[PDB]
PDB file of C-alpha atoms and ligand atoms in Angstrom:
ATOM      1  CA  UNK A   1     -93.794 108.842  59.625  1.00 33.11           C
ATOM      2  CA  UNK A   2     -93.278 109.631  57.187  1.00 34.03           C
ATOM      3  CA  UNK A   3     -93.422 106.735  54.162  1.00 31.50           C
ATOM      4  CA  UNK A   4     -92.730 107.058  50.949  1.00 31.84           C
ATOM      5  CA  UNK A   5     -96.752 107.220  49.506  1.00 34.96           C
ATOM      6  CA  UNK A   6     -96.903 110.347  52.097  1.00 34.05           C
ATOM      7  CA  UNK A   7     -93.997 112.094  50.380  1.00 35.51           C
ATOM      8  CA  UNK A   8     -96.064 111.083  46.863  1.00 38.13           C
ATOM      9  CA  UNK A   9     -99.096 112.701  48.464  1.00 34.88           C
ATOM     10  CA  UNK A  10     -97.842 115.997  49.647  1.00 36.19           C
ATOM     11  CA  UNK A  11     -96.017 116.853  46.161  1.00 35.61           C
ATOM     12  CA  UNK A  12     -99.457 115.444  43.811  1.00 36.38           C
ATOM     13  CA  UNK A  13    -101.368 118.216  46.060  1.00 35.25           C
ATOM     14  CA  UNK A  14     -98.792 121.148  45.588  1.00 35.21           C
ATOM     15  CA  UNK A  15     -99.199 120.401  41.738  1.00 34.50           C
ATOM     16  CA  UNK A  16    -101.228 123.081  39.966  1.00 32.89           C
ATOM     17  CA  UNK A  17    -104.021 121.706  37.861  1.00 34.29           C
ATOM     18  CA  UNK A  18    -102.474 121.710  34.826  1.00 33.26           C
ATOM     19  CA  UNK A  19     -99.473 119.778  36.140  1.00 34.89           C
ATOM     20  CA  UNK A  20    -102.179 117.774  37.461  1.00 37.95           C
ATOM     21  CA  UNK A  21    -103.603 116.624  34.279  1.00 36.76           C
ATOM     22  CA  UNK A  22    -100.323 116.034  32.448  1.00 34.91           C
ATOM     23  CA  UNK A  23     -98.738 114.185  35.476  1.00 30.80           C
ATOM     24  CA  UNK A  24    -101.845 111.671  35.972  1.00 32.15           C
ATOM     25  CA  UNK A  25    -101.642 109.936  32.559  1.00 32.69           C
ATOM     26  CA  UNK A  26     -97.480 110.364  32.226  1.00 32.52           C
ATOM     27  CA  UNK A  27     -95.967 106.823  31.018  1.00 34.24           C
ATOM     28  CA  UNK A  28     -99.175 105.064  32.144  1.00 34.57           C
ATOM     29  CA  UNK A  29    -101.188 102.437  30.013  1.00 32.61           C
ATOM     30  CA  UNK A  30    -104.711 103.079  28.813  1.00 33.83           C
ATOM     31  CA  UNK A  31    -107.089 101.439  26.569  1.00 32.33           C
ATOM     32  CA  UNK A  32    -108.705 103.616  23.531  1.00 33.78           C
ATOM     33  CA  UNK A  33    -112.519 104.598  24.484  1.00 37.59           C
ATOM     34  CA  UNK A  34    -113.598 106.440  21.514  1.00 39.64           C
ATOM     35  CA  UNK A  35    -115.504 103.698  19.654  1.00 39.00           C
ATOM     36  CA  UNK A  36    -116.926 102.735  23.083  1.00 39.62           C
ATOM     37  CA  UNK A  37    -118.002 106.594  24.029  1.00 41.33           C
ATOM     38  CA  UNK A  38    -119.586 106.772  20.658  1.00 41.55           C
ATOM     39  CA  UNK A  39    -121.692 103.541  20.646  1.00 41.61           C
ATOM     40  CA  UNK A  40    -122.833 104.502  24.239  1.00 42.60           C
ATOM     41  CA  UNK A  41    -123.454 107.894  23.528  1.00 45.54           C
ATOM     42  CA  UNK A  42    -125.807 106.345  20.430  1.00 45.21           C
ATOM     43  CA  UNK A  43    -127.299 103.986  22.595  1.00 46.95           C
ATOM     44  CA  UNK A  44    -125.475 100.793  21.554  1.00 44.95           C
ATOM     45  CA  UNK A  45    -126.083  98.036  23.678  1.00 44.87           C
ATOM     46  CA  UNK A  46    -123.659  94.990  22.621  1.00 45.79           C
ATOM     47  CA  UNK A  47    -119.892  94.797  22.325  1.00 47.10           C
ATOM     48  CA  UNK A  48    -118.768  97.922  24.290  1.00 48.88           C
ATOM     49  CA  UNK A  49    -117.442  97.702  27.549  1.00 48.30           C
ATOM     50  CA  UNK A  50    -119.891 100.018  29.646  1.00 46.57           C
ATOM     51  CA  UNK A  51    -116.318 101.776  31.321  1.00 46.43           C
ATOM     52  CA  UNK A  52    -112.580 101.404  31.510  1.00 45.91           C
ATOM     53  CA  UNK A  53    -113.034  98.781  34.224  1.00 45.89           C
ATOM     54  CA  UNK A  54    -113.628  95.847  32.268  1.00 48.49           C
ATOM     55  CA  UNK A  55    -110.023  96.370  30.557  1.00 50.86           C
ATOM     56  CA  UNK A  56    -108.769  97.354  34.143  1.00 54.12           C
ATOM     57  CA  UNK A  57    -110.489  93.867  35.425  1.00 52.16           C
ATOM     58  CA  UNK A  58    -109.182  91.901  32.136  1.00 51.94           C
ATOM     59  CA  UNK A  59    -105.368  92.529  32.992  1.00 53.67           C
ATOM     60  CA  UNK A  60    -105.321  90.897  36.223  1.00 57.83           C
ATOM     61  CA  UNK A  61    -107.989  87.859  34.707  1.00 57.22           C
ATOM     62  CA  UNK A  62    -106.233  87.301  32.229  1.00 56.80           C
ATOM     63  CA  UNK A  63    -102.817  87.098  34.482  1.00 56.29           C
ATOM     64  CA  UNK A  64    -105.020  84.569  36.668  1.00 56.76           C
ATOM     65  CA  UNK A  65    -104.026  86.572  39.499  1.00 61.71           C
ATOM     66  CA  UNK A  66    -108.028  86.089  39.873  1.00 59.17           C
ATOM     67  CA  UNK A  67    -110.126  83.531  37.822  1.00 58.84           C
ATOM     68  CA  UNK A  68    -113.797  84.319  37.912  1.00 61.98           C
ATOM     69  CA  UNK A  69    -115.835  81.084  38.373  1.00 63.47           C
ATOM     70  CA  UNK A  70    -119.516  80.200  39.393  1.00 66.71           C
ATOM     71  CA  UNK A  71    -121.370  83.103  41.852  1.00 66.44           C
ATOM     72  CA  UNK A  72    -119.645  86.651  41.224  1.00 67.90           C
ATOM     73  CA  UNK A  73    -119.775  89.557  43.698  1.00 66.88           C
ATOM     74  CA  UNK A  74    -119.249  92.771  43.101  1.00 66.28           C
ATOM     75  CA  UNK A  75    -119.298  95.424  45.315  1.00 65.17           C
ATOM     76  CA  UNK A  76    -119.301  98.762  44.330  1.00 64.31           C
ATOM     77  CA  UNK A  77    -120.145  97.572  40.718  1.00 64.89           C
ATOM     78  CA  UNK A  78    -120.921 101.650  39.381  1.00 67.95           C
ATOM     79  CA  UNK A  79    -122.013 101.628  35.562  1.00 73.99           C
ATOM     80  CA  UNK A  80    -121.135  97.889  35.646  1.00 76.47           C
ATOM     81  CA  UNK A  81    -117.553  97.345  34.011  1.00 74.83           C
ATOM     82  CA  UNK A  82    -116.118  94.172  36.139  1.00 75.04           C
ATOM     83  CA  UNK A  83    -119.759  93.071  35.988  1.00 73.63           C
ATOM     84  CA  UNK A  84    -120.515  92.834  32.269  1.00 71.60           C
ATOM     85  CA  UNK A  85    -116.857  91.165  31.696  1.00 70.98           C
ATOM     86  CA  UNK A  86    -116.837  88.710  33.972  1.00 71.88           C
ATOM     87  CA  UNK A  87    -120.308  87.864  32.387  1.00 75.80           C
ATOM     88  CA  UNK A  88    -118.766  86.601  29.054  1.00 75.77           C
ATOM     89  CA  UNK A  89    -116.271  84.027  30.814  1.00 72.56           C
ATOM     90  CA  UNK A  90    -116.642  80.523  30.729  1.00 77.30           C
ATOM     91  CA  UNK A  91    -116.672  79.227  34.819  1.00 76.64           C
ATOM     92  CA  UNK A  92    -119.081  82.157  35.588  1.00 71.07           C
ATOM     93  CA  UNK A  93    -122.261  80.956  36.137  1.00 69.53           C
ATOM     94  CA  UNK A  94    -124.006  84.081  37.942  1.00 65.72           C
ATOM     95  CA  UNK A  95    -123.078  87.951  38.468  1.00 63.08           C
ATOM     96  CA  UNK A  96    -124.317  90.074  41.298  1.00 59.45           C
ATOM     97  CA  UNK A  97    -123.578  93.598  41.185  1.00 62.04           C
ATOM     98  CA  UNK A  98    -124.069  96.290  44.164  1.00 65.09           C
ATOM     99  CA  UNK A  99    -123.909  99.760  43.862  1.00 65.31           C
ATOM    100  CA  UNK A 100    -124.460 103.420  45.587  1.00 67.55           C
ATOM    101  CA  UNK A 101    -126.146 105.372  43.323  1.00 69.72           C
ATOM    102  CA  UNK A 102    -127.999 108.423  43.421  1.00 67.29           C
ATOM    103  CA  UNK A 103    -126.507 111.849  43.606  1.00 69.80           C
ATOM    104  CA  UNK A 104    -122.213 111.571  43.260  1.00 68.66           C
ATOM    105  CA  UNK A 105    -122.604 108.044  41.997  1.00 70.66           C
ATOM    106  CA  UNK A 106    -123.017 106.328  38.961  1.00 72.81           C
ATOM    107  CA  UNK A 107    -125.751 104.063  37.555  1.00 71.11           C
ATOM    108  CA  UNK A 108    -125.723 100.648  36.504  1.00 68.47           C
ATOM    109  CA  UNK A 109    -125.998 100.708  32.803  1.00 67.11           C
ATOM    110  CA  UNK A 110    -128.193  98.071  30.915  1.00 67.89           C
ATOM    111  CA  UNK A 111    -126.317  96.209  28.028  1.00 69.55           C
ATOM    112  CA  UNK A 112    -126.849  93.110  25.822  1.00 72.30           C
ATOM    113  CA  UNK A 113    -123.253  92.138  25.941  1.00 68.03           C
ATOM    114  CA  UNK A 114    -121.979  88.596  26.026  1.00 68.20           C
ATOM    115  CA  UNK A 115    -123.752  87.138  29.015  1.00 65.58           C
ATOM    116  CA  UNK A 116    -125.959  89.518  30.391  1.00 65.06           C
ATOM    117  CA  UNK A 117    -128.288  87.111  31.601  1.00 66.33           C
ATOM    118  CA  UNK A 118    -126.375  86.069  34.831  1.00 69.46           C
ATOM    119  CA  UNK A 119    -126.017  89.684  35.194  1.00 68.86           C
ATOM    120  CA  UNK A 120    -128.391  91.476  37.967  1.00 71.21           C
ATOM    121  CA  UNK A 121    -126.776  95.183  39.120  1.00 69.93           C
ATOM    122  CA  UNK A 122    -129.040  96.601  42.182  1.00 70.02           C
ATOM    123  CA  UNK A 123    -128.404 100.718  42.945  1.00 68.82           C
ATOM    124  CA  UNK A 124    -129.047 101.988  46.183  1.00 66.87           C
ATOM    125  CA  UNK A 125    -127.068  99.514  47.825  1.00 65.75           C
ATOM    126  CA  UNK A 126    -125.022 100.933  50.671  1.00 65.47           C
ATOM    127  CA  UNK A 127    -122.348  97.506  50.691  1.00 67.83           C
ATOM    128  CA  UNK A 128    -121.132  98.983  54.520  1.00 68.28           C
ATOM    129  CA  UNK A 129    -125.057  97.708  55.661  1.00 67.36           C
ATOM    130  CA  UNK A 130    -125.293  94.741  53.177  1.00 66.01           C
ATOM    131  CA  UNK A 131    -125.070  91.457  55.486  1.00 65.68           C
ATOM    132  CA  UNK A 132    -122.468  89.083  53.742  1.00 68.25           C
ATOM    133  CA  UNK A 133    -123.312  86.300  50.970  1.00 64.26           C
ATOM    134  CA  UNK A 134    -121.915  83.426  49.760  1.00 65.70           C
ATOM    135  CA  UNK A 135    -119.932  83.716  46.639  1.00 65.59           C
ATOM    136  CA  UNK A 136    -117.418  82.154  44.253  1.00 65.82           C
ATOM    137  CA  UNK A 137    -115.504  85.285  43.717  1.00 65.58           C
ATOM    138  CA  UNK A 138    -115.688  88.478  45.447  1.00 66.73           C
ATOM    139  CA  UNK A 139    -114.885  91.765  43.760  1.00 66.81           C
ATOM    140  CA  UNK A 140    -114.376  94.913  45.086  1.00 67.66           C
ATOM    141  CA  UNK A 141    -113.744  98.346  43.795  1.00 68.02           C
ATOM    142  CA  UNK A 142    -114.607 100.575  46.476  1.00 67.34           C
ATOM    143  CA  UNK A 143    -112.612 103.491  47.422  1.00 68.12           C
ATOM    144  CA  UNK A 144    -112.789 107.666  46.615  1.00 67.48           C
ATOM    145  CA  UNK A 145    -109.416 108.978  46.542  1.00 69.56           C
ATOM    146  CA  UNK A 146    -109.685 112.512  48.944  1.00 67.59           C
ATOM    147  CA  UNK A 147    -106.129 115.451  49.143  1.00 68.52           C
ATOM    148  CA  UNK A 148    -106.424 114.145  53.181  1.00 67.85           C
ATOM    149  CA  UNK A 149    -104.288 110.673  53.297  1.00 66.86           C
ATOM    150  CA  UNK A 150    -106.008 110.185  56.344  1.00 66.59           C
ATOM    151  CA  UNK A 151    -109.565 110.250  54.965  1.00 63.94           C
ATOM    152  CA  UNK A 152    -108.053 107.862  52.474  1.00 65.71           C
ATOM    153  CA  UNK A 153    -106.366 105.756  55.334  1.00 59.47           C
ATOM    154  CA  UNK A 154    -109.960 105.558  57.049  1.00 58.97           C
ATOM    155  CA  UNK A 155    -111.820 105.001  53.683  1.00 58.24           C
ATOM    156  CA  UNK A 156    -109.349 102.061  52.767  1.00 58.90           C
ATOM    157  CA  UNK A 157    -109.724 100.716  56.789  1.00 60.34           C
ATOM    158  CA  UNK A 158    -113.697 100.554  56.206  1.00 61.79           C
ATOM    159  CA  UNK A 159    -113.688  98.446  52.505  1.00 62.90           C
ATOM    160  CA  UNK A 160    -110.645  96.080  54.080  1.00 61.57           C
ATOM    161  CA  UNK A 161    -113.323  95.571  57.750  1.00 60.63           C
ATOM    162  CA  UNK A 162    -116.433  95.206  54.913  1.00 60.23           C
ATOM    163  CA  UNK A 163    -114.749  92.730  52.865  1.00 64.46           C
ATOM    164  CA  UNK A 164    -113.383  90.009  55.023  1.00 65.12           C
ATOM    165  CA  UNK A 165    -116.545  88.105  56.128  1.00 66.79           C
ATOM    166  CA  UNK A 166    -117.145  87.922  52.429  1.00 65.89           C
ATOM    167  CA  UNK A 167    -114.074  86.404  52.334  1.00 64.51           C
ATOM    168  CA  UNK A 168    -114.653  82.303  52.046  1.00 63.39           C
ATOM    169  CA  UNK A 169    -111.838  80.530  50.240  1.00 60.29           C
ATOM    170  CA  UNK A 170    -112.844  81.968  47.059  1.00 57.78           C
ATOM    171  CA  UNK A 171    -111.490  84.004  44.400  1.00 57.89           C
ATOM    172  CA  UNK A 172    -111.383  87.621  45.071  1.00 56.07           C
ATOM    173  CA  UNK A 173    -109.266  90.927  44.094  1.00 57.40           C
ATOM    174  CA  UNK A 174    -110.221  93.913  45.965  1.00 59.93           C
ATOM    175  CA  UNK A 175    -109.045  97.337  45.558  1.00 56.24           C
ATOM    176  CA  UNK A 176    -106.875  98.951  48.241  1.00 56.49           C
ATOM    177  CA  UNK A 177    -107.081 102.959  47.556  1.00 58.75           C
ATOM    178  CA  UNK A 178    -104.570 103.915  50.208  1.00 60.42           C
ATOM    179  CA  UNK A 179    -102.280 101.009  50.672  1.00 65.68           C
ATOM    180  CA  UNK A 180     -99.132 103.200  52.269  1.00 64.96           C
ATOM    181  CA  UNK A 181    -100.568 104.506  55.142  1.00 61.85           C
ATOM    182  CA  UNK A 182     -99.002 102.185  58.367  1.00 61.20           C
ATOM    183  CA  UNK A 183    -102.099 101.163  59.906  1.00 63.10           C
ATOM    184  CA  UNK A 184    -103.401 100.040  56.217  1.00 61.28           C
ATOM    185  CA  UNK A 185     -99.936  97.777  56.141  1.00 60.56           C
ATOM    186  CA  UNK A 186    -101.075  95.998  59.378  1.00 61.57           C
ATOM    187  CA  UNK A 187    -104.472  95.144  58.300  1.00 56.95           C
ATOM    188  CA  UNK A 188    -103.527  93.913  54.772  1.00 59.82           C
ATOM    189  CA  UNK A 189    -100.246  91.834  56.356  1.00 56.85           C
ATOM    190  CA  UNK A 190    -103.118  90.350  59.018  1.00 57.35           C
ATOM    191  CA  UNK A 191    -105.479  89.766  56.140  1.00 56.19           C
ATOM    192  CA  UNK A 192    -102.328  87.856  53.863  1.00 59.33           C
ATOM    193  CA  UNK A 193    -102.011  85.535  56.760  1.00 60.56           C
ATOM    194  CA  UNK A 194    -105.500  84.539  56.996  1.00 63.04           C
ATOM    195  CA  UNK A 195    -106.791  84.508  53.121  1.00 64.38           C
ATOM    196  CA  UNK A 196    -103.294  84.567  51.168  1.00 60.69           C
ATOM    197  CA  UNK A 197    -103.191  86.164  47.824  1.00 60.34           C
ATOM    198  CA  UNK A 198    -100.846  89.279  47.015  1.00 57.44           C
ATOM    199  CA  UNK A 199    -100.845  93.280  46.924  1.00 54.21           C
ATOM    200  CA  UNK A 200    -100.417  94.271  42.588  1.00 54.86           C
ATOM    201  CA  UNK A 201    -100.202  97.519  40.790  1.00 53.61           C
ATOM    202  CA  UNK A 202    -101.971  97.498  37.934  1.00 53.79           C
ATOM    203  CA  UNK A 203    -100.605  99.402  34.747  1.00 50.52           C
ATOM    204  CA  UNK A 204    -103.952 100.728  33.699  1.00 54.75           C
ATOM    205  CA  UNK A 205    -104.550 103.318  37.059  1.00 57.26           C
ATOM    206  CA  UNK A 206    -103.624 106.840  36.855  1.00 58.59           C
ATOM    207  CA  UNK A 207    -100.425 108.425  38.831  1.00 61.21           C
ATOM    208  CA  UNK A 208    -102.825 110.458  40.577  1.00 57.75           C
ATOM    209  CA  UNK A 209    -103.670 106.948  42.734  1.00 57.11           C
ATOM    210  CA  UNK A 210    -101.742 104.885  44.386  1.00 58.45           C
ATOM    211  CA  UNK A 211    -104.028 102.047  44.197  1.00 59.40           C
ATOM    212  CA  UNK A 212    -102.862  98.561  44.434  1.00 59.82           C
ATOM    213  CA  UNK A 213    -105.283  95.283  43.956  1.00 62.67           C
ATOM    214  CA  UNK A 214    -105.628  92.544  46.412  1.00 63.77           C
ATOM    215  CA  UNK A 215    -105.594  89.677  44.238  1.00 63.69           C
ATOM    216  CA  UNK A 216    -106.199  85.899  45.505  1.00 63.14           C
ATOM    217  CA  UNK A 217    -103.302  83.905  43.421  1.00 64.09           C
ATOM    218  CA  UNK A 218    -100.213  85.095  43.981  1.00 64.24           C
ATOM    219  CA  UNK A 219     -97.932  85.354  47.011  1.00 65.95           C
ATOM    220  CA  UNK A 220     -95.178  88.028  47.916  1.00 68.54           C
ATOM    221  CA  UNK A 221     -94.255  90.986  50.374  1.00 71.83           C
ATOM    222  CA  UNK A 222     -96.494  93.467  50.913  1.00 70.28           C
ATOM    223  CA  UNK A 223     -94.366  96.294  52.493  1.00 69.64           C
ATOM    224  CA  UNK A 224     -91.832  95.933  49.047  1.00 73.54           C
ATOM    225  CA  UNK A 225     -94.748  96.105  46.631  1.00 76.59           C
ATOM    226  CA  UNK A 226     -95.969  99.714  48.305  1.00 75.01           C
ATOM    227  CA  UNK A 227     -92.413 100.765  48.528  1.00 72.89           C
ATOM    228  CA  UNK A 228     -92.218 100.291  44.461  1.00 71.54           C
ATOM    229  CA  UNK A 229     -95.412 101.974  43.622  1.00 73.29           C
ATOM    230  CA  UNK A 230     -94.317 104.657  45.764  1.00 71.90           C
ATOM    231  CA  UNK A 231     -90.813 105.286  43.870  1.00 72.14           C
ATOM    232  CA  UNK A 232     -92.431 104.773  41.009  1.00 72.90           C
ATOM    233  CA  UNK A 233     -95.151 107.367  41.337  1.00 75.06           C
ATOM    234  CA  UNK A 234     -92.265 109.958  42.744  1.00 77.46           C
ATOM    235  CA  UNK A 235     -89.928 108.979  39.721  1.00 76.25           C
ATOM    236  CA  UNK A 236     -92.870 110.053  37.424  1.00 76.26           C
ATOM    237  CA  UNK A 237     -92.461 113.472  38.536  1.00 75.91           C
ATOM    238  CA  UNK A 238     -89.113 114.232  38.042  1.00 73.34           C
ATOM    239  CA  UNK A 239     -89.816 114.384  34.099  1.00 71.14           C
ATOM    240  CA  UNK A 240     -92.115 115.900  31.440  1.00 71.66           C
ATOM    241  CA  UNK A 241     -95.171 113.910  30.756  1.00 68.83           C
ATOM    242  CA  UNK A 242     -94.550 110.722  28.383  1.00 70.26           C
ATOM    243  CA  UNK A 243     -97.645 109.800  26.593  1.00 73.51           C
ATOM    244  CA  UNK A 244     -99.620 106.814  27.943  1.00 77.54           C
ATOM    245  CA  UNK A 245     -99.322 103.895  25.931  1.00 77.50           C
ATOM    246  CA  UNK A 246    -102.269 103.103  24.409  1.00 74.77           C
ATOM    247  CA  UNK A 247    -103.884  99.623  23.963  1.00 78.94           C
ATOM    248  CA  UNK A 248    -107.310  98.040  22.327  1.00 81.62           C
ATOM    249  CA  UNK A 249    -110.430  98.030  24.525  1.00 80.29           C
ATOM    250  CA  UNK A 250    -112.632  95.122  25.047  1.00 80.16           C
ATOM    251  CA  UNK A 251    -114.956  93.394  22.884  1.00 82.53           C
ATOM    252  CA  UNK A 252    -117.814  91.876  24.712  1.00 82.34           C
ATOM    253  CA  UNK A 253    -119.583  90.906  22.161  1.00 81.94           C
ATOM    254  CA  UNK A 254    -123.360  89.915  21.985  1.00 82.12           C
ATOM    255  CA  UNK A 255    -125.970  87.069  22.840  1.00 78.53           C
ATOM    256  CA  UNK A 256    -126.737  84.488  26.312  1.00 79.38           C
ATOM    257  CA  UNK A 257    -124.665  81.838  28.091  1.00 77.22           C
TER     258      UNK A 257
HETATM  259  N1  36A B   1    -115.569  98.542  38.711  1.00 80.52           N
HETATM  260  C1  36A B   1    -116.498  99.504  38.123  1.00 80.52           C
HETATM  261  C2  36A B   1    -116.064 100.935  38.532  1.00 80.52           C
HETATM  262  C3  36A B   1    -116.547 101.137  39.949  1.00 80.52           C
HETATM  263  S1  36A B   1    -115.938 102.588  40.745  1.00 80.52           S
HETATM  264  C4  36A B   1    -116.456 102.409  42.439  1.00 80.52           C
HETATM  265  C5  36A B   1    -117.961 102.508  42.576  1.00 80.52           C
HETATM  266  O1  36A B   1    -118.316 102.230  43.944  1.00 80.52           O
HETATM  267  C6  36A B   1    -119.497 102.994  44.236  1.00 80.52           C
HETATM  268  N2  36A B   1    -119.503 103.119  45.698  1.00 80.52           N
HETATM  269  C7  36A B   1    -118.751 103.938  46.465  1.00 80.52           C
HETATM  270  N3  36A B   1    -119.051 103.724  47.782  1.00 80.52           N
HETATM  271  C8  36A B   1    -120.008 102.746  47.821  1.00 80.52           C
HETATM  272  C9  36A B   1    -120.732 102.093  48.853  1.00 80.52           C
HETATM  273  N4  36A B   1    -120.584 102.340  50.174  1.00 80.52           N
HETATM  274  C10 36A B   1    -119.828 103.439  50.719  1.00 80.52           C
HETATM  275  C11 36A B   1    -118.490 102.994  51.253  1.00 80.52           C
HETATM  276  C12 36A B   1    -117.367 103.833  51.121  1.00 80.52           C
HETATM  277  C13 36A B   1    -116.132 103.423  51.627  1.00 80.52           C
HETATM  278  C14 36A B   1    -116.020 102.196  52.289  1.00 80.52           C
HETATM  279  C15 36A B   1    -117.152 101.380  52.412  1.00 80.52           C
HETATM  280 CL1  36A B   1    -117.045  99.817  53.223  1.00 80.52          CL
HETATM  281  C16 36A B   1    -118.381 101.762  51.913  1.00 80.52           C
HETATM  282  N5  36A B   1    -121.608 101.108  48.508  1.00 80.52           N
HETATM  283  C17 36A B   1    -121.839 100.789  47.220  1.00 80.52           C
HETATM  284  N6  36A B   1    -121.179 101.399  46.219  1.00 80.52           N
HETATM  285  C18 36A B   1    -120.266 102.369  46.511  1.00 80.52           C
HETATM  286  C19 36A B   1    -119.265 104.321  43.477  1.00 80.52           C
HETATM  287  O2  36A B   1    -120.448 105.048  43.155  1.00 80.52           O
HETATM  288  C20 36A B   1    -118.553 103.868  42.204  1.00 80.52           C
HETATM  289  O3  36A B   1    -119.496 103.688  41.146  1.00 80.52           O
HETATM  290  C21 36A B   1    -116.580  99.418  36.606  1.00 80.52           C
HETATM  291  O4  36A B   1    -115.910  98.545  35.962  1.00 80.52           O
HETATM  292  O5  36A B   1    -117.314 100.202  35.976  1.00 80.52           O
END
């Protein structure tokens, strides 16, 4: 090839664990969990965010790179993060949530946070067999990150193939778990044609992921945006860790819409 993201790869692999761990969080951002842990852990059912993916969601909502409105997808929904936040927002009018489950996989987790009532998670869902539906916004956070780029190339191939017939005009951001690989570059430049939106990096994932979003507003190259994330990701290396900056998690309050 060999891109940038491979070169990336190859040295997060050679890191020994304990390089691992300080290198993932070095100089990212990261929203405080403790309350959060310890109201779950108690069995606390309003205000906390059920996972860090309701902050991770937030920062591109509240960018309006997507804006959440009427019937909400969301595929690969796990404990229920981008579920139970896009819940509490004013243009949503329904949530559907899919998920794996089972061994490997997290549950959907039952809250009374703001909203909860357009809210219904289903486990056991397999999205690769689920026939398309229609939808105001489609969501997407599908991908396991794998040592092999090219189980991560193939992974990333299957969610971008699932997603498009979802795909209807609407809102959607999608997550791209390998977006370096070249044959992942075709695919998203022949999706940008047909259904716009942009490639984004969001400040919240870990260096140990080079995950972008597929977001629906925006516009912009492709090919540069990987290219960043990839020198960015290789510049974090090069220095000892910097502690992630951390920010205020979510309030999701309590009660119906
Ligand atoms: N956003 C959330 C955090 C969510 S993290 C991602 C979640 O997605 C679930 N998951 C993984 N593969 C799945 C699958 N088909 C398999 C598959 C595999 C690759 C490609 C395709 Cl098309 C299909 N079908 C359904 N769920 C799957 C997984 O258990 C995790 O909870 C939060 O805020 O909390």
């Amino acid at each position: 090839g060999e891109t940038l993201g491979e070169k990336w790869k190859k040295k997060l692999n050679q890191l020994s664990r304990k390089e691992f761990d300080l290198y993932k969080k070095s100089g990212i951002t990261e929203v405080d969990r403790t309350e959060a842990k310890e109201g779950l852990k108690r069995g606390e059912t309003t205000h906390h965010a059920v996972s860090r993916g309701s902050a991770k969601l937030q920062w591109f909502v509240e960018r309006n790179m997507v804006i959440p409105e009427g019937r909400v997808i969301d595929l690969g929904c796990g404990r229920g993060g981008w579920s139970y936040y896009c819940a509490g927002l004013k243009k949503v009018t329904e949530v559907r949530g899919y998920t794996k489950g089972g061994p490997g996989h997290e549950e959907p987790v039952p809250m009374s946070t703001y909203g909860w009532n357009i809210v219904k998670l289903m486990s056991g869902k397999d999205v690769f067999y689920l026939p398309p539906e229609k939808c105001d916004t489609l969501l997407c956070d599908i991908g396991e990150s794998s040592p092999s780029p090219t189980v991560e190339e193939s992974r990333t191939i299957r969610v971008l193939k699932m997603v498009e017939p979802w795909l209807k005009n609407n809102q959607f951001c999608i997550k791209v778990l390998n977006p370096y690989m070249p044959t992942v570059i075709e695919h998203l430049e022949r999706l940008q044609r047909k259904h716009g939106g942009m490639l984004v990096r969001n400040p919240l994932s870990r260096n140990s992921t080079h995950e972008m979003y597929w977001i629906s507003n925006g516009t912009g190259n492709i090919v540069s945006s990987v290219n960043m994330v990839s020198r960015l990701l290789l510049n974090r290396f090069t220095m000892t860790h910097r502690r992630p900056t951390i920010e205020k998690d979510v309030d999701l309050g309590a009660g119906t819409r």
